[PDB]
Amino acid sequence: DEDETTALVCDNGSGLVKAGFAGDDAPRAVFPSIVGRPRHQGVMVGMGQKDSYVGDEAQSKRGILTLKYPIEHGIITNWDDMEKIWHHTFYNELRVAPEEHPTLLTEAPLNPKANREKMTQIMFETFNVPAMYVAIQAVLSLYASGRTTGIVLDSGDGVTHNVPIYEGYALPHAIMRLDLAGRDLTDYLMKILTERGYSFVTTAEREIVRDIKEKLCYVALDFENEMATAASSSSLEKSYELPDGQVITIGNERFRCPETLFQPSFIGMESAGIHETTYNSIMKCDIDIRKDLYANNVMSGGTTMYPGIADRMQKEITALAPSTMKIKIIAPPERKYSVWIGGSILASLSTFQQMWITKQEYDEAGPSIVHRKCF
Amino acid sequence: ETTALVCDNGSGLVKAGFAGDDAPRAVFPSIVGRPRHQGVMVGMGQKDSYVGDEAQSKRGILTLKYPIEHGIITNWDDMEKIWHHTFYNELRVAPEEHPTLLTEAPLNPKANREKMTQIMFETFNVPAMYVAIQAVLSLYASGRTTGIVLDSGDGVTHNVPIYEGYALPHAIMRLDLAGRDLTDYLMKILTERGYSFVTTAEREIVRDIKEKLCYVALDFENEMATAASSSSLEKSYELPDGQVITIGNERFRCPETLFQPSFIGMESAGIHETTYNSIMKCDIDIRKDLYANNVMSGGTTMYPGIADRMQKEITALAPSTMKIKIIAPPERKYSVWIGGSILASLSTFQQMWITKQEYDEAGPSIVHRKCF
Amino acid sequence: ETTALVCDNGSGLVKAGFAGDDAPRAVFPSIVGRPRHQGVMVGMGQKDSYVGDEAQSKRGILTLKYPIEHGIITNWDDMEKIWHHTFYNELRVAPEEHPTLLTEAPLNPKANREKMTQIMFETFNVPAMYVAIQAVLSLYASGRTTGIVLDSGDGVTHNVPIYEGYALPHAIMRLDLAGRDLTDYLMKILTERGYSFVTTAEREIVRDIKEKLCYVALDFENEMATAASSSSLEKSYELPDGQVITIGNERFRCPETLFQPSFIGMESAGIHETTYNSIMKCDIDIRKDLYANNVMSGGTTMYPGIADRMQKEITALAPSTMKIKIIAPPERKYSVWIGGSILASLSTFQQMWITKQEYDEAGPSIVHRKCF
Amino acid sequence: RRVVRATEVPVSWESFNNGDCFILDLGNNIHQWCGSNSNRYERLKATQVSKGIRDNERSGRARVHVSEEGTEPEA
Ligand SMILES: Nc1ncnc2c1ncn2[C@@H]1O[C@H](COP(=O)(O)OP(=O)(O)OP(=O)(O)O)[C@@H](O)[C@H]1O
Ligand SMILES: Nc1ncnc2c1ncn2[C@@H]1O[C@H](COP(=O)(O)OP(=O)(O)OP(=O)(O)O)[C@@H](O)[C@H]1O
Ligand SMILES: Nc1ncnc2c1ncn2[C@@H]1O[C@H](COP(=O)(O)OP(=O)(O)O)[C@@H](O)[C@H]1O
Ligand SMILES: [Ca+2]
Ligand SMILES: [Ca+2]
Ligand SMILES: [Ca+2]
Ligand SMILES: [Ca+2]
């Protein structure tokens, strides 16, 4: 079997942070990665008025705060706020000292190098962990499914990337990355809600539009027939309740928002959809391995949690591929946390103990050890 | 009395002009642009298809498509748009008066030759036409009749041996990476410095960065060591949004994909040993001058230091009992056009034209018996 | 009590099994693969060297090297890997119990024989060993004691005259083209249809196209005429990506390189008249039987119509006062193994083994005096 | 759960349960059937046993198929 360990897995994704222990089946702390700062005059002295709020309490008091995401499309921008986020997830959520626990972290492919040196520098100098490893999210998602052969479409809040892996060997020349994910879908939904007269400008309103996107939007099987159905009748309209008591209704905007994933020309990008990105990701691989990669399409991330996206994906890949091929798409119900589940697997494997970047290796080699060890 | 035209249809850079000139009159990239947003300001010169350098000017509001890919014509209506834009807008001539010379890649399929014949005779109504090869005009521009030609343009790279002024079809080989794949690899290896380029509009900017700041390292590992240790080779570029990028060790790593295709995951051979693989396939008697005449042509031979690195790499794995020299003229990016302009302007070329009435009672099959 | 092993080490297809059997137990290609990308799925049984049909299965993500080239052992460590995969993985037996019979190419250098003896006796610790020749064992497979053998496998083509059950070393001749060069020729003549195969991974796909769809034309020029005029012989093939290619005149042009070597440029003779050249080098009085036993062997004799074309080409240029027949059994691609199985199972073969203790007080030199 | 093992079971639909994983061996075709309630470690063990029984017993002369509920092939 696999030996025990005291490692931590902390998926530091763009919208959410999922932190927990290696070997467990579910991450212990799931909370959105925001830092809130007050934009109003505090006239009541006392009662612990903090200068900054982090985590779920920043979601609780979001009306009187401006909220900032330090991660923007995978790249960490504000290191102080994201350092405050790791301090909150080490000390307040898990309630563990990082000095006697190795830490596994996640990162999208084709990020800049300086993210990896700065991540190494704040993990080794500030918290003083004894070990570190950083891994690709889609590799971890393919660890979650239990397969080895397949293409993983991992789509978080900032990054949507296609990674094909045949057997154990990834193909780095076929790695596709597109900056089209839940942030841009939320912003496009905020744009098209003005067609019914509902205005949303602030960051708490952006959180409310994120909630309505999670709760009502769905992927249509065919866009023009669904548009004709929505124009002809009124059965597709559904209602939603604001926290102040106002009630809104939405019709075609349920399915116009995720259609940006399949047609990015709505938000002005001439890059093609995720189905053609998957298709030419398969086509950039050499000729012998297309057969297995068609039948093992794996989706992961919260952005793949729309209903009906698998049928539209099956129809578009079945249209693009030749007709003799069988195309199978794997959409497990636990695909939101699959990056963390594969992280718990990879931290729990017995082979992995001779790939930890130790303290003395960092001390002898600088922050540049991580590019020679990880990936 | 009339003047012939030379039109070298490159895969990403088309050249055109009049015969008997020392330089091509128009050099412009072979693209077709189409608009991607709605034109709300009507009656102000909006077109449904921008073609040529005009599409390169307003490339931000367009999507670009290359009609020729990998040296082979694929989209034909866009190629008709390219020929119309050469004849009417660039050269500003009527096609009915002037004969036209065309160049094609080696090992061109016959159907493409017939289709170029059919649209050149029917649509534009030319009086004369002829089709030649890139590599033979490159060798004629060098003033030689026997030698190896490495034509590395934007789509494909070709190694063509030529003996007694004719190619050897058994030993011509096509290695399919060129400046498009170098541009895509530089697009890959600028992400780690935080600079993001994704769409086809900024691909031309990465091509300009590749043209202005690249060089072939004579030895790779000590160059990487000096790039890692010092900062004497790190240099800046000014993007047209005003932001200034800086590039260090990626200046020389991107030319090295020609010598190492495994950088882009291609399992095929590097550029130095495929010429060796071509030259063993030739006959044993004719190698002695064939090693001596190393003709380089194409725009991707314009890197500084590619000739000395090529000399080192051939001299390493060839036997040491013979002398290797490589020639590289400064005009080698236009040498196909120079060979065509010498060939069209001769006193023996008027009988080699394919006239209109010869096309009439033979159809598009007389090109199979006259351009050989 | 124990059973002997027969292991025919082909240049691109190695056969193995137990003595006394009517077919070899394992047929698999002699290919050693090495990975070309980095393994990010750690701990999941990733290997630094994939060998055999396992390398053929995951052939996209590997670079493939042949340890035997042209019937001669060159890379010895990979050849030991072929032996380790053959004994331990394929046959699933320990070499310490079973005697082993090997096959060698004709006119093998003696140092290769000594090293085959040394890695059989030291590394695997066999109790008995013997080496034998491909062509005479094919003649014993034909049930004859006198005849010519055209053994044309994947590396070379051998023409061996045998009289009174022994070869005649002045008259064995070698012609260096076989199905590997036919695969490279078919790789060349699919480029005109627009299909590109450039790396070693898809070379077996082209080999499968050659195996499934090829035939020998009895007459070539009329077959050109019917292929150019009609399209009755054009057939489709299904690539494992799902693209469907279509093959016309290239189905039968690929066998014709054997009869016309100038299709791929070397100046040597075709397969039909080199047998005439070999049989003129023999003595006169033997030739009355020596023409009559035309033993065909090797996997490149599997083409339909090779026997009728062989009969026609021999009957054209031999004198007309003598009858010619061509024999081709259906099991001639395995005939070397069938000969090894019958020779290893004899009642007189126990004294011809080279035992371990005979190797100990003689070293690696006793193989010359006993395998003779 | 931790010490995952394989056991030969007779070929019938009644032997199947949703909580474990199954490997159907039919010569040149090897089918991997995963339960809906099956966990991570026996899925990894099923994949490892599948690649082992392809590449060692059959030496790569097989094709490994992975399937779950509702996507059972015709074999
Ligand atoms: N100084 C330079 N350094 C590097 N690359 C250059 C330079 N000048 C031009 N190029 C590249 O050369 C290519 C075009 O050269 P050229 O005009 O010889 O090709 P072409 O005729 O279009 O191609 P092909 O022969 O494949 O049809 C482009 O990729 C361009 O970026
Ligand atoms: N049906 C077929 N049609 C065409 N070619 C075939 C066919 N079957 C096998 N071959 C070819 O025959 C060759 C293998 O034959 P064989 O096993 O006799 O060779 P070998 O023993 O490896 O070679 P060598 O005698 O040079 O050592 C390969 O080139 C293979 O492509
Ligand atoms: N049920 C749902 N329907 C649609 N979108 C969802 C759903 N659940 C989560 N999402 C989207 O997934 C994004 C975050 O997904 P996840 O990958 O789990 O976090 P991260 O992107 O931080 O790694 C959010 O932006 C949210 O919009
Ligand atoms: Ca994520
Ligand atoms: Ca050119
Ligand atoms: Ca053989
Ligand atoms: Ca169970």
From Swiss-Prot, chains B, C:
Broadest EC class assigned to this enzyme: hydrolase
The EC number(s) this enzyme carries: 3.6.4.-
Residues recorded as bearing Methionine (R)-sulfoxide in the entry: 41, 44
The domain of life is Eukaryota
Query: Among its keywords, does the record have Nucleotidyltransferase?
Result: no
Q: Which molecular function GO terms apply here? A: actin monomer binding; ATP binding; calcium ion binding; calcium-dependent protein binding; cytoskeletal motor activator activity; hydrolase activity; identical protein binding; magnesium ion binding
Q: What is its main location?
A: cytoplasm
* Record keywords: Acetylation, ADP-ribosylation, ATP-binding, Cytoplasm, Cytoskeleton, Hydrolase, Methylation, Muscle protein, Nucleotide-binding, Oxidation
* BP term (GO), one: positive regulation of gene expression
Which reaction is the catalytic activity of this chain? ATP + H2O = ADP + phosphate + H(+)
Comment field (misc): In vertebrates 3 main groups of actin isoforms, alpha, beta and gamma have been identified. The alpha actins are found in muscle tissues and are a major constituent of the contractile apparatus. The beta and gamma actins coexist in most cell types as components of the cytoskeleton and as mediators of internal cell motility.
Q: What is this protein called?
A: Actin, alpha skeletal muscle
Species, as recorded: Oryctolagus cuniculus (Rabbit)
Q: Taxonomic classification, please?
A: Eukaryota, Metazoa, Chordata, Craniata, Vertebrata
UniProtKB/Swiss-Prot annotation, chain D:
Which stretches are tagged as biased composition: Basic and acidic residues?
Answer: 53-68
Q: Which domain of life is it from?
A: Eukaryota
Task: From the UniProt record, list the Gelsolin-like repeat ranges.
Answer: 4-75
- Which residues pair up as cystines? 21-34
Transmembrane stretches in the record are none
* Binding, Ca(2+) 3: 19-20, 42
Effect on the protein of changing residue 20 to N:
In AMYLD4; does not result in actin depolymerization in absence of calcium
What tissues has this protein been observed in?
Answer: Phagocytic cells, platelets, fibroblasts, nonmuscle cells, smooth and skeletal muscle cells.
What is stated as this protein's family in its record?
Belongs to the villin/gelsolin family.
Q: Which disease is it linked to?
A: Amyloidosis, hereditary systemic 4, Finnish type: A form of hereditary systemic amyloidosis, a disorder characterized by amyloid deposition in multiple tissues resulting in a wide clinical spectrum. AMYLD4 is due to gelsolin amyloid deposition and is typically characterized by cranial neuropathy and lattice corneal dystrophy. Most patients have modest involvement of internal organs, but severe systemic disease can develop in some individuals causing peripheral polyneuropathy, amyloid cardiomyopathy, and nephrotic syndrome leading to renal failure.
Q: What is known of its domains?
A: Comprises six structurally related gelsolin-like (G1-G6) domains, that, in a calcium-free environment, are packed together to form a compact globular structure in which the putative actin-binding sequences are not sufficiently exposed to enable binding to occur. Binding calcium may release the connections that join the N- and C-terminal halves of gelsolin, enabling each half to bind actin relatively independently. G1 and G4 bind two Ca(2+) in a type I and in a type II manner. G2, G3, G5 and G6 bind only one Ca(2+) in a type II manner.
Under the subunit heading, UniProt states: Binds to actin and to fibronectin. Identified in a complex composed of ACTA1, COBL, GSN and TMSB4X. Interacts with the inactive form of EIF2AK2/PKR. Interacts with FLII.
Report the function annotation for this chain.
Calcium-regulated, actin-modulating protein that binds to the plus (or barbed) ends of actin monomers or filaments, preventing monomer exchange (end-blocking or capping). It can promote the assembly of monomers into filaments (nucleation) as well as sever filaments already formed. Plays a role in ciliogenesis.
Q: What is this protein called?
A: Gelsolin
Encoding gene (name): GSN
Parent-protein start and end of this portion:
195 to 269 of 782
